[PDB]
Amino acid sequence: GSSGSSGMVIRVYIASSSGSTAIKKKQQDVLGFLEANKIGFEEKDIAANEENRKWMRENVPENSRPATGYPLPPQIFNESQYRGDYDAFFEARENNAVYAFLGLTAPPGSKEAEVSGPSSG
């Protein structure tokens, strides 16, 4: 086990074929971000592809699972493991620790690397 190539793929399970604008937005909020941040993520649709949704559902942690009706998108997933939803995404964002919440790396000089200030989760 050893190599020198970029990895850690960020797979997100969205529902392209969704209806609730909020969702669409949220999803687009998680995607747009990874896009604006030029992050190496993957767009996984749950609407069409069931396995993705199902599998994902079987992956999603209970502590993360809602009351009932499977976890709603967006849904961030590290390759296969689960990270969090738009909620966990935003939170990790405000805390400028998204990359960490995605198991990614932060750039040297950014606020993610700087991390210097009082009152911090």
Per DSSP, 12 falls in state: E
Per DSSP, 11 falls in state: E
Q: Which two tokens stand for residue 77?
A: 């997933």
What lies within 8 Å, CB to CB, of 118 at 6+ separation is: none
Measured over the CA atoms of residue 10, residue 13, residue 19 and residue 21, the dihedral's sign is negative
- The CB density around residue 10, as the number of other CB atoms within 10 Å, is 19
What experimental approach yielded this model? Answer: NMR
Query: Is 82 exposed, middle or buried (CB count within 10 Å of its CB: 0-12, 13-18, 19+)?
Result: middle
Q: What does the alpha-carbon distance between residue 9 and residue 24 come to, in Å, rounded to a whole number?
A: 22
CATH T-level fold of 1-121: Glutaredoxin (3.40.30)
- The CB density around residue 59, as the number of other CB atoms within 10 Å, is 15
Strands 81-85 and 10-14, by their bridges, are unpaired
